[PDB]
Each structure stands twice: as structure tokens, then as C-alpha cells.
Amino acid sequence: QRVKRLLSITNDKHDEYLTEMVPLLVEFAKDECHNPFIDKDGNESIPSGVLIFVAKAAQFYMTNAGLTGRSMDTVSYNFATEIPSTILKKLNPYRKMAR
Numbered sequence: 001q002r003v004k005r006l007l008s009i010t011n012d013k014h015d016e017y018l019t020e021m022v023p024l025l026v027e028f029a030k031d032e033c034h035n036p037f038i039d040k041d042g043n044e045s046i047p048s049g050v051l052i053f054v055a056k057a058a059q060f061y062m063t064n065a066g067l068t069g070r071s072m073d074t075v076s077y078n079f080a081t082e083i084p085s086t087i088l089k090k091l092n093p094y095r096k097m098a099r
Contacts, residue, residue, distance in 0.1 A: 010059040018058035024079045025057070026050055026091055033096035053090035057083045 010018040023037070023044045030037045039045040046054055061083045066073040092098065 006059070010063050011055075014062065018062040019054050021058045021062060021077070021079055022046075022054035022083065024077065025083050025088075026054060028080065029091055030096075033099050035095040047094045050091065050094050053087055057087040057090070060084050060087065 023046060026046060027037050027044060037045055037050075065071075065082070071078065
């Protein structure tokens, strides 16, 4: 139905692999704002809108460029200059938004 194509990939196979790439982007890039993307144990935290970003950003990037990439499927990561340009504005809308 094509609906399965979203969850049959980097959800059912890799919900833990694509989603972690993005709190390297959301937590590093947001560290700028000083806002609570951190939890009470000192672990990672992500809200609802920035969550649609973590999943859709990395299911676009990992499913495309871990393979049709050419710069390796696990490396000293590109997250700082990669993960698609348009969704990168969805990194920010929760708290602070800029500084």
C-alpha cells in the first residue's frame, strides 16, 4: 500500500540506528541554546516535533547515504555537516529556537 515502506525499513530493522544519528545532530546543535534536550540521569531527551525530525531526517539520510553514500556505513560521523538540509530547520522549533 506503500504505508509499510516507512516502517519496513529504518524502524522495523533499524529504529535504534537511524534515530541515534539525529540526537548527535539535535543534542550537539541544540547545546548552543542550552535547552533541556538532557534528562534527570544526564542522558538524552527529545520532544514531539524534534522527534518527527530525528526519525524522518535519519530515515531519509541512513536509508539513502549509508549505502548510496560512498563515505562508509559507520564512521567518525558526518552528522555535523549532513542529515538533509530542509529537516535541519525542524532541529530547532521546541525551546530557545536560536540564540
